[PDB]
Nucleic acid binder design. Structure first.
Lengths: 105, 81, 29, 88, 183, 21, 50, 96, 463
RNA sequence: CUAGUAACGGCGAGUGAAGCGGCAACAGCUCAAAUUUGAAAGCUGGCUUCGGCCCGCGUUGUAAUUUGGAGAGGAUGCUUU
């Protein structure tokens, strides 16, 4: 669902967990991408979302929760695939430092 | 070159089942009433390639018609290495 | 040219080296 | 949890149960030189001499299946090209 | 140590020397019979690893099996179909194991190791006299070969819970109403 | 039986023993 | 593309001088054969018994 | 006292004997079972073969009591046995 | 004061009398009672002054008093810079612990690594080790060193000079420090041995110098001989030199204990009456063989370079250096002195391969004169055919041939003078040809741009 | 017993295990990957007075040794048939 909203991105799967986290840096350099959105699953039940800028930029760990995707029929809304979004942010995104570098990502 | 190789190789033929049985009968009846190392041509694939891996072989002669050819297809490179 | 008599005679990168926020070592590729 | 004094253990003889012997590296290197290359490996070789390392790495991903196998195959083939000019 | 070299060569089977051999053998095997016999194994290292010896009572047979679906899929493997066809041909022999030897766009080629339980070299040898016993009649028909043990899920773990003792035995155990005397 | 299993059973057979109370 | 190429010896072009096996040689390769010495004395026992 | 805290030392009393175990108002059947347990057993000693004593008798007559020279002599020691093995073998024959 | 009046155990005392050592040499007399009390000491002694017995007596005494077993692991660690000095220490430790129930073992470079780990895992109470493979075992192998009581650093100056700086610092970090004896023996008091002392020892040492300040280092009154000899003909030169210069006094040097043993049994089979002096003999036999040599008129002693450092070489006519020497400062200066032998006319020669001509440049840079010695090709007694026959048919002399070959190559690689002597210009076929082989036995000669977006490790548990 | 638990589902009907724990019974092993190479030592036949003769199989590998919480080789000194 997220990759259907980013025309400037490409998909990949089956990344070896026993590999190193900076081999994700080698992977995106090979595919010519300066950002990575990494989905790490623990136990087959817990999702961890990684945001980074691939050569040198900062990295944020998240823990995803309460997931709902387009296949549920109660959503009743639709948008042009690849169309440019209006990003809406918060006031607390603007003031506080650690969320402010997150808003950049 | 085949005839000269087989002239040397015939001189170092192994002992057949008859003259080995007689040779063991020699030492048995003499024990009732002193040898050096035997030198024979070595054969068998795993025996020969073990010998060439250990640099104990002087000359190796390979047949051209092994029906599964894979059993000898590494042999010219292994001998050359 | 053996200066000292009998000891042994004395005998690249894709990054830049600069310090991090904790006063350590980081790299710019 | 509970405080128990720990023991050292004798070395497992099942450790690294592949083949790290110096002899098995001789067999693997000798067979590769005798056998040659697969058709897919020949394409990765040709891209690596031409300098298209990114295209060779991506081709290995699609053919083998995982990225770590693409790194392994391209490393072995790059060492083949390195040893080829050493003999040359 | 010629068979270690053969093991490494068999791993590399799309390479130039082996793909040449696999091409010329497939042409030869195609024009022979379906269930013809082999005097010597085409892969002597795989036959040795699987239990074949150069002894009287051990024979090798080559089978071609048609490849493809039965979108219904036949749950029997092509190796299991190959093993069943030798046993119905060589009904006096016992199927020891089988291995892959060749491939095509229409057929798959397998080589099957058979043991004669009625030879005297076999009954004398305690490493192979177990197959002389009447429990091992037609192992390929009961899923008792390496192919059958794979398709029956005979492994251990949480991953093989339903099939680690037989699914029909486990389903009988899990669907049985056990009533005791002093309930 | 095999030779390797005869050599084992010759020198290490099932001994006969008892345990006191 | 050249369809089927020439093979370059990148491994056999160098020759190493030592055997691969570093294992010690057994004593059996330096002494008279114990296996035949058993066979001889079996032939002695058969000849003694007649 | 005990310096190194090993629990095995408190329980104590690099090879051990391998075919037997060295061991240091009650029912009659138990009393019998200890009696055939500790009854004396015949040794049933093992002798050397006739060729073995002839091999040693040939060796002692040539060299003597110098076991080192019997180890490095090819014509009477073709199996190239260590002098300590022949010394142990000579003691079994009775020759010094 | 002698060995008896210092109170030892009956097991230590009986083994001491078996060697014949009764009279305490000076370093043993004033450093063994301080170590027995439990005070860490510093020693400025010279190699061969009996200092090897000086630390093994307190080491053995504590093992027996604390009653160590194989399941308790290593109690004492003795760090030795090179292989053959460690093999000498292991030789005397075996004579020490012949009446004890403790375990001794040796860890050295070039040895079998996974055989040594099994040796260590079973339990070795007294361990003599090269600092390189000690650190490899300490970081990678599972074995007990948590009950360590003494640490011996023997020729600490030579350890630093070889290049074991970082290995010494990482060892003192990993080994336990609480309630540990420490000994530091050295010869010259450099700045580097001061930093090693301050980080390994307890804050109050007990230092003693007997270091010989009257070093008569002569740079002009000396003369060194040398032969240029092909690699496959070095033993044939030794054989022809010894048989033709027989009925004379000759001392010959080697590099390893295994090569001395092998060449001793060779020359007796080839019928040369020659005396040997190596580490695997009993100590009482070594004094008898050396005393019989000194009051002899003619003959030859085969002895390694390491055993002859502490040995008073008598008036000999020829000093022979078959192998590369351990310390060439020790070699060129002191045995050049003992070659002259006060009044006698004695000479010393050095066997050199064509790949070792760089030693001449060091000779010319040091301004000490040389003399060529040349051989005709009709004087070499070609006995290679009967040497190869004897190795190929005798199993004991074949075993010693492998051991002498491996010990020679391992010592060649672990040389300080890597420029003049390194193993990579040796051809192993000719080296094994001199040792008596058609084909060389297998040995191990060996024994930036980084990842994209890779930062150093902030923390975590690693093993 | 866990347990109608976890898990899956027109989340309705429903479906539906396992580790642990208490018992019953318990027993471990054979190969392939090694050069016997100072000696294919292995085996099927059918001819016999049966005591031992040939024929074949087999070196593209039949015996012995060994099967990775191992093992081999030397040395070593006790203990086993």
């Amino acid at each position: 669902d997220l990759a259907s909203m980013l025309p400037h991105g490409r998909k990949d799967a089956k990344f070896d967990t026993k590999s190193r986290l900076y081999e994700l840096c080698e992977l995106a350099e090979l595919y010519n991408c300066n950002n990575v959105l990494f989905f790490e699953a623990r136990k087959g039940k817990d999702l961890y979302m990684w945001f980074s800028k691939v050569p040198n930029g900062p990295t944020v760990k998240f823990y995803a929760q309460n997931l709902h995707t387009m296949e549920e029929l109660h959503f009743q809304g639709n948008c042009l695939k690849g169309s440019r979004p209006i990003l809406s942010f918060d006031a607390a995104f603007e003031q506080e430092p650690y969320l402010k570098v997150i808003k950049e990502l | 070159l085949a005839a000269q190789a087989f002239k040397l190789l015939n001189k170092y033929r192994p002992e057949t089942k008859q003259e080995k049985k007689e040779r063991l009968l020699r030492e048995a009846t003499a024990i009732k009433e002193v040898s050096k190392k035997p030198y024979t041509v070595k054969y068998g694939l795993n025996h020969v390639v073990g010998l060439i891996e250990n640099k104990k072989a002087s000359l190796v002669l390979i047949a051209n018609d092994v029906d599964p050819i894979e059993l000898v297809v590494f042999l010219p490179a292994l001998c050359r290495k | 040219e053996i200066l000292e008599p009998f000891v042994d005679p004395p005998r690249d990168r894709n990054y830049r080296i600069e310090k991090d926020a904790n006063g350590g070592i980081r790299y710019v590729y | 949890g509970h405080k128990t004094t720990r023991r050292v253990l004798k070395e497992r003889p099942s450790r690294r149960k592949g083949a790290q012997s110096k002899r098995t590296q001789f067999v693997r290197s000798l067979i590769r030189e005798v056998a040659g290359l697969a058709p897919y490996e020949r394409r990765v070789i040709e891209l690596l001499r031409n300098g298209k390392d990114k295209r060779a790495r991506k081709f290995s991903k699609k053919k083998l299946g995982t990225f770590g196998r693409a790194k392994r195959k391209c490393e072995e083939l790059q060492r083949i090209i390195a040893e080829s000019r050493r003999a040359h | 140590g010629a068979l270690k070299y053969l093991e490494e060569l068999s791993k590399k089977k799309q390479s130039d020397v082996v793909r040449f051999l696999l091409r010329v053998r497939c042409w030869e095997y195609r024009q022979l019979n379906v269930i013809h016999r082999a005097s010597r194994p085409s892969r002597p290292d795989k036959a040795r690893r699987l239990g074949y010896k150069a002894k009287q009572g051990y024979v090798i047979y080559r089978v071609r099996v048609r490849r493809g679906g039965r979108q219904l899929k036949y749950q029997r493997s092509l190796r299991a179909t190959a093993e069943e066809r030798v046993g119905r041909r060589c009904s006096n022999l016992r199927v020891l194991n089988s291995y892959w030897v060749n491939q095509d766009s229409t057929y798959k080629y397998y080589e099957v190791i058979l043991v004669d339980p009625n030879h005297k070299a076999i009954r004398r040898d305690p490493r192979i006299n177990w197959i002389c016993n009447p429990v091992h009649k037609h192992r390929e028909c009961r899923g008792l070969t390496s192919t059958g043990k794979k398709s029956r899920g005979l492994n251990k773990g949480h991953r093989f819970n339903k099939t680690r003792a037989g699914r029909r035995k486990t389903w009988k155990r899990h669907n049985t109403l056990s009533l005791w005397r002093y309930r | 039986v095999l030779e390797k299993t005869k050599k084992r059973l010759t020198h290490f057979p099932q001994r006969k023993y008892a345990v006191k109370a | 593309e050249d369809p089927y190429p020439d093979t370059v010896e990148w491994f056999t072009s160098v020759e190493e001088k030592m055997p691969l096996s570093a294992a010690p040689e057994p004593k059996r390769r330096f002494i008279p054969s114990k296996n035949e010495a058993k066979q001889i004395m079996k032939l002695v026992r058969a000849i003694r018994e007649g | 006292s005990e310096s190194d805290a090993v629990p095995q030392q408190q329980q104590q009393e690099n090879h051990i004997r391998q075919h037997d175990l060295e061991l240091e108002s009650k029912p009659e059947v138990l009393r019998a079972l200890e009696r055939e347990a500790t009854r004396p057993v015949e040794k049933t000693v093992r002798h050397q073969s006739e060729r073995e004593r002839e091999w040693l008798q040939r060796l002692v007559d040539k060299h003597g009591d110098d076991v080192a020279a019997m180890a490095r002599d090819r014509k009477l020691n073709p199996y190239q046995q260590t002098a300590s093995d022949i010394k142990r073998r000579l003691k079994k024959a009775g020759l010094l | 004061q002698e060995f008896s009046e210092l109170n030892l155990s009956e097991k230590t005392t009986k083994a001491i009398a078996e060697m014949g050592f009764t009279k305490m040499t000076e370093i043993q007399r004033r450093a063994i009672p301080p170590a027995l009390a439990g005070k860490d000491v510093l020693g400025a002694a010279k190699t061969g002054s009996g200092k090897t017995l000086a630390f093994l007596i307190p080491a053995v005494e504590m093992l027996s008093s604390l009653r160590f077993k194989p399941r308790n692991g290593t109690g004492a660690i003795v760090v030795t810079p090179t292989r053959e000095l460690a093999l000498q220490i292991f030789g005397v430790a075996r004579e020490l612990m012949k009446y004890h129930s403790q375990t001794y073992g040796v860890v050295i470079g070039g040895a079998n690594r996974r055989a040594e780990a099994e040796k260590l895992g079973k339990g070795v109470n007294l361990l003599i080790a090269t600092p390189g493979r000690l650190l490899d075992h300490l970081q990678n192998t599972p074995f007990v060193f948590k009950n360590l009581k003494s640490l011996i650093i023997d020729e600490a100056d030579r350890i630093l000079e070889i290049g074991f700086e970082d290995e010494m610092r990482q060892i003192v970090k990993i080994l336990p420090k609480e309630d540990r004896q420490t000994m530091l023996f050295s010869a010259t008091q450099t700045t580097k041995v001061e930093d090693l002392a301050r980080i390994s020892l307890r804050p109050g040492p007990l230092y003693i110098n007997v270091d010989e300040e009257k070093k008569y280092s002569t740079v002009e009154g000396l003369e060194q001989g040398y032969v240029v000899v092909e690699a496959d003909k070095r033993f044939l030169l030794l054989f022809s030199f010894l048989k033709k210069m027989a009925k004379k006094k000759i001392i010959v040097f080697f590099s390893s204990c295994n090569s001395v043993k092998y060449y001793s049994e060779l020359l007796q089979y080839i019928d040369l009456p020659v005396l040997d002096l190596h580490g695997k003999q009993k100590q009482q036999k070594r004094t008898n063989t050396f005393f019989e040599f000194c009051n002899a008129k003619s003959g030859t002693l085969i002895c390694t370079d390491v055993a002859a450092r502490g040995l008073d070489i008598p008036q000999v006519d020829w000093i022979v250096q078959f192998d590369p020497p351990d310390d060439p400062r020790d070699y060129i200066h002191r045995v050049g002195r003992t070659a002259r032998g006060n009044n006698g006319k004695g000479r010393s020669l050095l066997f050199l391969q064509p790949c070792e001509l760089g030693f001449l440049a060091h000779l010319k840079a040091a301004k000490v004169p040389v003399v060529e010695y040349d051989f005709p090709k009709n004087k070499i007694l070609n006995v290679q055919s009967q040497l190869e026959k004897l190795i190929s048919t005798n199993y004991y002399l074949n075993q010693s041939a492998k051991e002498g070959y491996r010990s020679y190559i391992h010592a060649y690689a672990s040389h300080s003078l890597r420029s003049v002597f390194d193993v990579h210009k040796l051809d192993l076929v000719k080296v094994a040809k001199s040792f008596g082989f058609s084909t060389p036995p297998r040995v191990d000669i060996t024994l930036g741009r980084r990842a994209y977006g890779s930062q150093p490790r902030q923390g975590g548990r690693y093993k």
